[PDB]
Amino acid sequence: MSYNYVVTAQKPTAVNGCVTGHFTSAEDLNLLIAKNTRLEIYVVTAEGLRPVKEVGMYGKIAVMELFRPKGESKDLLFILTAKYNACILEYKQSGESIDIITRAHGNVQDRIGRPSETGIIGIIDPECRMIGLRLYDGLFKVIPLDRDNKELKAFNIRLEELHVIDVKFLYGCQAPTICFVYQDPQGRHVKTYEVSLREKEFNKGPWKQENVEAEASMVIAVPEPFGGAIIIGQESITYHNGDKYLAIAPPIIKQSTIVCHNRVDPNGSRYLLGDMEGRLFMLLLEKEEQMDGTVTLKDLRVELLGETSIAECLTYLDNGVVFVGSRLGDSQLVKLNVDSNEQGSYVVAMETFTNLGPIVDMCVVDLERQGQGQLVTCSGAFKEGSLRIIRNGIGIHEHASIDLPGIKGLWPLRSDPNRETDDTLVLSFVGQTRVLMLNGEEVEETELMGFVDDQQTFFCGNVAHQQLIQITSASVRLVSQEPKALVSEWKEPQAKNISVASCNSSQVVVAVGRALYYLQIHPQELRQISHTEMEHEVACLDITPLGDSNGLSPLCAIGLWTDISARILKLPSFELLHKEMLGGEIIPRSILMTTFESSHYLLCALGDGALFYFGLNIETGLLSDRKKVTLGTQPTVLRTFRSLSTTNVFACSDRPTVIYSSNHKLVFSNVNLKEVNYMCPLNSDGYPDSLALANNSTLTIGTIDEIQKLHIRTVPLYESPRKICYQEVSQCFGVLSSRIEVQGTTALRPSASTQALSSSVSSSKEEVEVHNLLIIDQHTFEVLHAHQFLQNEYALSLVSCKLGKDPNTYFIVGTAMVYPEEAEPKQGRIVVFQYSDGKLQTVAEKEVKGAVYSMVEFNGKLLASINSTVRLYEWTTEKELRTECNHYNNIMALYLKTKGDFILVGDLMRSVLLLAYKPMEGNFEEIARDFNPNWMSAVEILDDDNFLGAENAFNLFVCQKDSTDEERQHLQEVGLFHLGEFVNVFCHGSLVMQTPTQGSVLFGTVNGMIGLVTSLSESWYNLLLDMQNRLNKVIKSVGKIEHSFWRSFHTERKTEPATGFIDGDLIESFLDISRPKMQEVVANLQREATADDLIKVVEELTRIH
Ligand SMILES: Nc1cccc(-c2nc3ncccc3o2)c1
């Protein structure tokens, strides 16, 4: 009935978990990071983190632990998903190919069972005897680790303690033993049990229970030789080992709850601890010797090390390097020093990794140019709060601009053999060459002895033996560096024109029609080595040396006319090693051998904007795994360049692109420039690490931004942003923010709301939240003004609009007065503000008897939701809000969107409702509601007949009118899809410059994932649904989870297959399967579709984000 397509624009960035161990090999130290559905694998080096493999799971990662059974040469990986898919995984690398093998899998959900409120805990016995899971209160699930248990069959043990806080397996025990903290009416306690595989039951544990602190929250299992357990609370740290009990109460930890730990030393002598304010501590266990050679714990000390991002997880990585995994801010690599700095910190940040999450609100604005949307998010929380400005494509920073038309090629060179930097740029034109010298920033015409100016140059550069080369249509010219003189000249035997040229430091291959000549560069000598006659006219050549080659290529890559082939030839014989026919009647224009992330590729661009690429074996010359993308509609010219110590390929066309590698796959990112015809890298005194760019009329010099799909600007607020709106007439944003103060109440640090240029305060008629409206400049993101709300006043909703016949644009804020014992608020305000002359003036107020959860401008009026009421206000001539009409049939109306006279209302627990304003009756009519209960997080109107909801269990659904009257009032859920993210905000718009899809809705999530929803025809839906089913038969999923299971709508009330939703991430993955697989997919598929049809289809779909 409705057909929707959902695709990832930005993968989740929040770190949900981290572990270290030896997974990729026994001798590698690995960091594994869980980002919701993604697992990232790194090798830890001196240099830092090298990425080796990133995979997606068809599940949310809830447990991630490395372990090593006897007989295994390296660690295996246990994963449990939030839908209770369990697997054991093994890393396998066969040559260049890397695969995650599933050693065991099965689903471990029970039939009855309310998910424990305090979440899934999974733990692994140190001796790998069993995996233990706390999934539900009152039960402990055991998976025995026998070699025969490939289905991960489990049994449940009754657990008398219903409210477990945390649990670990202990070290040094003859039977598998758990230690856990639990809560009962008498307080919190620590207890142990042995786990008997024979009896499938608990036995008495080795040490008796103790009462612990009221807020004891984490258990640490300390390795031998200590053994035992550390229990971390809010004001105490205790150690237990039976006839051993030791407790400290250090004041230094009392300010903020400690929420994560990591073992620094294998023997447990030191642990890192992180708290909710980003403090990093070291916990030190002091040893005492004993006559019998055991070691017991003498004392415990805690030392403040410094400050990090607020850590969800910590991993020590050796040599003082710590990974800080953050959910609420950026993740980091930090270094711990033995000696402190000026301010007394041992912590120095080394590297920052972007986290957009949580995205709590966002808007789309054309900040810089018309038609180019940028997303501005409210990101992070507490000291990590920020605005983030997100935009597609890679920028260039122009540093020079010369009027100079007709350029046909650019080459840099070093005219001085004693200087490392380029000082010369050679330009070709039709039939001519010009040399430009660079003196700092000055760029000046000149001659260069040895080079000719009256022929077109096809290549020039530095070559071996301190020489320069120029290849023109007439000859190859070899020039000495000191002095500049012609030392050798090569011409074809009858002096026919050269038509194509390739060159490296010591080798030359030139074409003359169908003839090829191979030359070597020697001292004062161009030596002709060999020649051949190709079957067809030569279109393009490359001899870029790859790998451990010593600057020499044994291969020549060639593109031919007529048969449209890309071929690899051996030098010097010119023997054919491999031929690929590219199809069509349009010749290759650019061919390049290149390396990315240590793998070799052949790139071949046609004159129609097609780019083919292949794996290249530089030993055998074999091309494999052909792929194709379209980079424009014009001939593309390819050229290698380096930035940030990485070689990439710049593709010149009508749509300039950078080609690079990410997770050992080629990626393509737009450069934000108009048409570029030619380019070369340029690294001169005045223009270090730059690019020279030419179009039809202009030569530019500039630097390039980071090579990535999306560019992100961060604006730190040092406090929690809550909502955002743009006010075009003021050229600024309004942002609701809150900061924590401690009760007179005192602030913890300066932040946006206490550092505005000017400030104002409302006048009345982790201790406390103080709320503010910030006014922020759209260009500088400076905080121009901050208005502080009343004590106990929480700002919930924000809109920028005009009302009635009043020409002013206002910022309007809806609030709640929050008191401790109230089930919900019974008081709040709507406040209308005018931003004028650097400050917010209060124009009007309205007291209401509830929380103002949501507001929208509606046909020149103000729509607001207040507790269980939706209300429409008019703006009177006396500049006051006056109630027009009310709707009462809600539990708690949290979310509003409107289109025309229609209003979509999202409820706390009864899903969505459609209202209409009746302009000829001045009131609301309830049109229809979704009678299925759903706990809503966000809503959006897709169009007049289709309503999108997100709910708290990470599902999307789509409702439509069912086209009796009682019947017309029943909205139908026609689309269902498990997304696996928590949606905070939907907003209409696109990051692409303004096909199979209609409409564009972006969403922002808690994990900092950004998605897109668009609409499909029935026809397109049917084709893509068929593709999915076929893809699902050929793709091997990690952990052998079925895609259909993953995407099934799932709440406590209802599990059903997905319907009316295409998984764009799955569809896009078609462009990464093998050619056989594509054939399997494309067989007997409705017109009988071919692989190459689908490739093109999936490209039109990738361009929507
Ligand atoms: N050297 C290198 C290259 C590319 C990506 C990364 C990286 N991205 C991360 N995101 C979160 C946490 C840790 C991370 O490390 C690191």
Side-chain angles (χ1 to χ4, degrees), residues 3-46 48-91 93-95 97-111 113 115-116 118-146 148-149 151-203 205-242 244-253 255-337 339-341 344-367 371-418 420-436 438-446 448-495 497-569 571-584 586-644 646-654 656-673 675-708 710-742 744-764 767-820 822-825 827-840 842-877 879-917 919-963 965 967 969-997 999-1035 1037-1081 1083 1085 1089-1099 1101-1102 1104-1105:
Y3 314 109
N4 291 292
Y5 182 91
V6 51
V7 67
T8 299
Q10 171 58 65
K11 283 175 186 178
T13 57
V15 170
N16 309 108
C18 53
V19 299
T20 55
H22 308 282
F23 183 53
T24 56
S25 75
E27 36 284 315
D28 286 337
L29 176 64
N30 298 120
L31 175 63
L32 278 59
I33 304 176
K35 295 181 174 164
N36 192 29
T37 51
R38 320 299 302 175
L39 175 60
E40 306 185 338
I41 307 157
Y42 299 88
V43 174
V44 181
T45 73
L49 300 177
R50 188 166 85 262
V52 292
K53 178 63 166 192
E54 192 257 30
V55 291
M57 311 271 317
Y58 292 160
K60 300 176 61 52
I61 297 164
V63 177
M64 179 179 66
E65 295 294 344
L66 288 171
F67 71 106
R68 187 180 296 183
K70 291 220 297 303
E72 296 294 332
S73 59
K74 58 194 194 319
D75 301 346
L76 301 181
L77 180 61
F78 176 72
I79 296 288
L80 183 64
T81 71
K83 286 181 166 189
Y84 308 101
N85 310 101
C87 59
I88 296 174
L89 308 174
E90 181 186 359
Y91 191 86
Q93 185 161 12
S94 48
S97 183
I98 299 161
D99 289 301
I100 310 299
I101 293 176
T102 296
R103 295 282 292 285
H105 69 106
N107 191 292
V108 293
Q109 69 193 127
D110 288 339
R111 279 177 284 191
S116 174
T118 295
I120 293 169
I121 305 167
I123 50 172
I124 308 191
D125 167 62
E127 321 313 313
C128 301
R129 289 163 292 185
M130 53 182 63
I131 299 166
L133 308 171
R134 193 297 295 273
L135 304 180
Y136 314 103
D137 294 344
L139 289 172
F140 184 77
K141 182 173 298 256
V142 175
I143 309 165
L145 290 164
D146 285 73
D148 300 318
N149 199 14
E151 297 189 340
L152 301 181
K153 285 161 176 157
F155 62 87
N156 276 329
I157 304 173
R158 177 172 171 109
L159 186 47
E160 285 298 310
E161 299 76 18
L162 272 183
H163 306 298
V164 174
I165 308 300
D166 196 20
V167 58
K168 290 292 195 309
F169 279 108
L170 295 181
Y171 289 95
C173 294
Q174 191 172 108
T177 304
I178 58 162
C179 171
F180 63 104
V181 170
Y182 67 97
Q183 180 151 358
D184 65 15
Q186 289 94 234
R188 280 189 188 178
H189 318 271
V190 59
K191 181 177 185 174
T192 62
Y193 291 121
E194 293 176 3
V195 186
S196 169
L197 287 173
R198 263 197 182 192
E199 294 171 353
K200 299 184 186 293
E201 184 47 66
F202 290 132
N203 302 159
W207 38 268
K208 65 197 177 64
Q209 70 168 65
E210 305 281 356
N211 308 311
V212 289
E213 197 204 284
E215 295 291 306
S217 70
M218 292 185 310
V219 173
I220 303 175
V222 185
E224 292 187 284
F226 295 110
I230 293 173
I231 309 290
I232 309 271
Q234 287 190 12
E235 66 183 287
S236 69
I237 300 174
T238 65
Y239 173 84
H240 300 269
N241 203 338
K244 229 274 87 73
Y245 175 123
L246 205 154
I248 58 161
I252 200 176
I253 66 161
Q255 298 179 15
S256 175
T257 300
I258 288 163
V259 291
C260 60
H261 61 81
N262 180 243
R263 196 177 58 234
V264 170
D265 301 312
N267 70 2
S269 292
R270 292 184 292 174
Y271 288 80
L272 297 161
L273 306 174
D275 78 9
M276 292 177 25
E277 283 180 344
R279 291 174 199 100
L280 185 68
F281 304 85
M282 193 74 84
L283 168 68
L284 304 100
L285 282 65
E286 193 192 2
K287 296 182 200 300
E288 181 174 348
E289 297 193 283
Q290 304 291 159
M291 284 299 283
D292 69 5
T294 64
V295 169
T296 62
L297 180 75
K298 182 155 188 173
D299 204 2
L300 297 161
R301 276 184 300 111
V302 180
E303 293 189 6
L304 183 63
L305 299 174
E307 199 187 86
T308 66
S309 300
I310 303 173
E312 182 63 9
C313 68
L314 293 163
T315 59
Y316 184 74
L317 300 184
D318 292 343
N319 306 304
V321 182
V322 179
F323 176 77
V324 184
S326 188
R327 281 193 290 117
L328 300 179
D330 289 338
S331 293
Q332 303 167 299
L333 284 173
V334 302
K335 177 159 268 286
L336 302 179
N337 298 128
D339 292 278
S340 70
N341 72 358
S345 183
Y346 301 86
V347 176
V348 182
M350 297 167 61
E351 191 164 8
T352 290
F353 304 109
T354 300
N355 176 26
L356 301 184
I359 298 161
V360 305
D361 200 13
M362 74 199 191
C363 69
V364 175
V365 173
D366 295 353
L367 276 172
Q372 184 203 13
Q374 308 198 24
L375 195 58
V376 187
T377 66
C378 298
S379 288
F382 310 119
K383 74 185 184 62
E384 312 300 346
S386 73
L387 306 179
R388 307 279 167 133
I389 304 90
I390 303 136
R391 58 141 177 92
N392 285 9
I394 301 164
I396 296 290
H397 303 294
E398 175 173 312
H399 293 325
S401 189
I402 302 178
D403 170 50
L404 184 40
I407 292 170
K408 289 300 176 193
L410 297 166
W411 300 267
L413 58 81
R414 301 178 275 108
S415 84
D416 187 341
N418 304 129
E420 281 191 349
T421 48
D422 302 317
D423 62 6
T424 309
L425 194 60
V426 177
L427 280 55
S428 195
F429 305 80
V430 179
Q432 295 223 80
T433 300
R434 292 171 49 187
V435 178
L436 313 178
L438 306 166
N439 270 350
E441 300 202 353
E442 201 56 279
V443 182
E444 308 176 55
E445 264 267 49
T446 173
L448 193 148
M449 183 68 222
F451 285 20
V452 294
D453 64 16
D454 60 347
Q455 305 289 345
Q456 186 170 339
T457 290
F458 294 144
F459 178 84
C460 73
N462 292 87
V463 292
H465 311 292
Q466 286 185 347
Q467 291 170 137
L468 304 176
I469 200 163
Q470 182 189 28
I471 306 175
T472 73
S473 58
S475 80
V476 180
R477 296 172 72 84
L478 188 63
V479 168
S480 46
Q481 280 275 51
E482 273 156 346
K484 298 221 150 46
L486 182 69
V487 293
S488 187
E489 191 173 23
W490 181 93
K491 291 175 182 165
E492 190 269 350
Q494 295 168 3
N497 290 346
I498 298 161
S499 56
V500 189
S502 53
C503 189
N504 59 41
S505 82
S506 80
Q507 294 170 301
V508 179
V509 176
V510 290
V512 184
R514 312 163 114 74
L516 291 174
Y517 295 87
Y518 170 41
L519 320 177
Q520 282 178 5
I521 302 168
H522 289 280
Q524 305 77 225
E525 182 193 4
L526 291 161
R527 189 178 299 174
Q528 185 175 319
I529 300 298
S530 57
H531 70 278
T532 193
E533 198 87 5
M534 300 302 293
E535 295 180 64
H536 303 300
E537 191 183 353
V538 179
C540 51
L541 285 166
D542 185 67
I543 57 169
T544 302
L546 292 188
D548 214 346
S549 71
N550 199 37
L552 295 156
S553 182
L555 306 172
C556 180
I558 187 163
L560 295 187
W561 292 71
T562 314
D563 78 347
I564 321 297
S565 53
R567 311 179 178 203
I568 306 296
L569 314 181
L571 295 168
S573 71
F574 289 112
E575 285 179 18
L576 178 67
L577 294 179
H578 192 91
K579 178 171 74 170
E580 289 288 340
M581 317 278 278
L582 302 181
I586 305 284
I587 68 177
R589 287 285 180 174
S590 185
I591 193 172
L592 191 64
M593 301 185 288
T594 195
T595 304
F596 297 108
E597 289 192 289
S598 310
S599 295
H600 308 305
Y601 294 86
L602 184 74
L603 274 43
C604 189
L606 305 181
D608 69 352
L611 188 276
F612 287 97
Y613 61 99
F614 307 74
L616 174 57
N617 186 313
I618 63 172
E619 253 65 286
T620 68
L622 187 77
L623 300 188
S624 53
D625 297 314
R626 176 203 290 233
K627 297 188 183 306
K628 179 197 186 192
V629 304
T630 48
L631 294 177
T633 68
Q634 295 273 353
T636 305
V637 188
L638 305 170
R639 187 76 164 252
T640 309
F641 72 101
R642 282 189 78 71
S643 58
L644 279 47
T646 308
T647 197
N648 286 151
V649 171
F650 197 105
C652 295
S653 69
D654 50 316
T657 295
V658 179
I659 312 172
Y660 62 114
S661 186
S662 170
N663 182 40
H664 311 270
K665 292 160 145 53
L666 295 202
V667 167
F668 303 86
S669 176
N670 304 297
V671 174
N672 295 334
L673 277 176
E675 180 169 12
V676 181
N677 299 327
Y678 303 97
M679 74 85 58
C680 71
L682 177 64
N683 182 29
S684 76
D685 289 347
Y687 306 101
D689 306 307
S690 301
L691 294 60
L693 292 308
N695 56 45
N696 295 111
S697 71
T698 307
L699 169 70
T700 302
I701 306 181
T703 60
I704 188 160
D705 282 345
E706 294 187 290
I707 305 303
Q708 56 189 2
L710 300 179
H711 179 272
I712 314 291
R713 170 178 183 187
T714 302
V715 181
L717 301 173
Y718 313 100
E719 64 185 19
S720 297
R722 295 290 182 81
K723 294 293 176 178
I724 184 165
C725 70
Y726 179 58
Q727 187 170 99
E728 194 175 357
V729 299
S730 298
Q731 300 275 287
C732 69
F733 292 93
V735 174
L736 296 182
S737 69
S738 75
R739 71 176 188 267
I740 296 299
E741 296 200 343
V742 290
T745 77
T746 308
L748 304 179
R749 63 193 74 75
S751 64
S753 63
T754 71
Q755 292 295 298
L757 284 182
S758 60
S759 66
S760 61
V761 195
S762 278
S763 62
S764 41
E767 201 74 30
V768 73
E769 304 190 11
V770 175
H771 290 231
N772 320 268
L773 174 59
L774 312 173
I775 310 296
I776 293 178
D777 186 87
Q778 75 174 61
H779 301 303
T780 63
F781 288 94
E782 167 172 48
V783 185
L784 301 176
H785 190 86
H787 174 92
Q788 182 171 306
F789 287 94
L790 297 167
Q791 192 167 229
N792 307 125
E793 188 169 38
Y794 287 31
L796 297 184
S797 50
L798 170 68
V799 73
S800 171
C801 61
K802 305 177 159 194
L803 296 175
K805 297 167 175 179
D806 174 352
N808 293 322
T809 309
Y810 299 118
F811 289 104
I812 312 182
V813 180
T815 77
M817 303 309 300
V818 175
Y819 296 112
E822 280 179 356
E824 79 192 308
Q827 277 188 339
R829 290 200 297 167
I830 298 174
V831 186
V832 181
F833 298 93
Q834 179 181 318
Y835 183 68
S836 282
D837 302 306
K839 58 206 146 196
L840 285 173
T842 300
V843 166
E845 316 189 6
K846 183 157 212 69
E847 298 196 1
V848 294
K849 294 198 290 180
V852 185
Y853 286 124
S854 191
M855 298 187 304
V856 185
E857 180 275 342
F858 183 75
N859 300 303
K861 300 166 184 182
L862 182 69
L863 191 70
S865 67
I866 300 160
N867 289 6
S868 64
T869 300
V870 179
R871 305 207 180 127
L872 188 62
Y873 296 93
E874 291 184 281
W875 187 236
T876 72
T877 44
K879 291 191 189 177
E880 306 291 359
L881 296 165
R882 166 90 191 249
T883 303
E884 172 169 8
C885 51
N886 300 295
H887 172 264
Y888 303 94
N889 188 19
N890 312 281
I891 295 297
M892 187 190 293
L894 291 172
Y895 311 111
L896 292 174
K897 293 290 176 70
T898 80
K899 186 187 190 289
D901 283 343
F902 292 95
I903 302 154
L904 187 63
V905 183
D907 191 84
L908 175 70
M909 57 178 70
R910 289 312 292 280
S911 189
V912 301
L913 181 155
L914 180 68
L915 300 177
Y917 174 67
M920 293 292 330
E921 304 179 53
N923 58 40
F924 293 126
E925 186 194 351
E926 185 179 310
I927 302 298
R929 53 186 277 233
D930 178 8
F931 279 92
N932 304 279
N934 281 301
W935 295 86
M936 302 307 293
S937 68
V939 303
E940 191 53 88
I941 306 165
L942 294 182
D943 70 22
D944 284 352
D945 312 292
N946 293 265
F947 315 113
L948 180 57
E951 63 70 60
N952 290 352
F954 319 115
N955 305 284
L956 304 173
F957 63 90
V958 174
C959 278
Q960 287 178 351
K961 277 163 289 203
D962 173 6
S963 69
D965 268 356
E967 300 175 17
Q969 294 183 299
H970 281 230
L971 284 180
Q972 298 299 309
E973 290 173 3
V974 304
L976 302 167
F977 183 81
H978 189 75
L979 171 62
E981 296 286 359
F982 192 105
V983 179
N984 282 328
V985 51
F986 294 109
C987 74
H988 285 272
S990 180
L991 295 186
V992 166
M993 257 287 189
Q994 292 296 278
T995 50
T997 72
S1000 185
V1001 173
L1002 292 165
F1003 57 87
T1005 69
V1006 166
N1007 289 317
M1009 184 271 185
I1010 304 167
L1012 178 165
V1013 183
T1014 187
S1015 292
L1016 293 166
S1017 61
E1018 186 172 6
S1019 158
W1020 277 111
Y1021 175 77
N1022 285 341
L1023 170 65
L1024 292 172
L1025 185 66
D1026 203 359
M1027 276 185 69
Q1028 290 198 167
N1029 290 336
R1030 291 171 187 255
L1031 280 159
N1032 289 334
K1033 286 268 98 87
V1034 303
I1035 290 173
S1037 58
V1038 179
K1040 293 196 201 313
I1041 305 166
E1042 289 292 347
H1043 180 270
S1044 295
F1045 176 84
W1046 165 226
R1047 292 312 197 175
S1048 289
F1049 183 95
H1050 176 77
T1051 71
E1052 241 61 72
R1053 284 185 179 284
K1054 175 187 291 178
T1055 303
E1056 278 192 51
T1059 192
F1061 277 83
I1062 296 301
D1063 182 353
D1065 295 353
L1066 173 57
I1067 292 302
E1068 289 183 351
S1069 71
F1070 174 77
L1071 295 175
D1072 300 313
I1073 67 171
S1074 75
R1075 296 278 277 175
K1077 282 163 149 52
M1078 299 199 188
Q1079 296 310 314
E1080 298 174 73
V1081 177
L1085 179 60
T1090 70
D1092 292 291
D1093 293 311
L1094 289 185
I1095 288 176
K1096 273 199 164 179
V1097 164
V1098 175
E1099 280 207 278
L1101 288 171
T1102 61
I1104 72 190
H1105 66 95

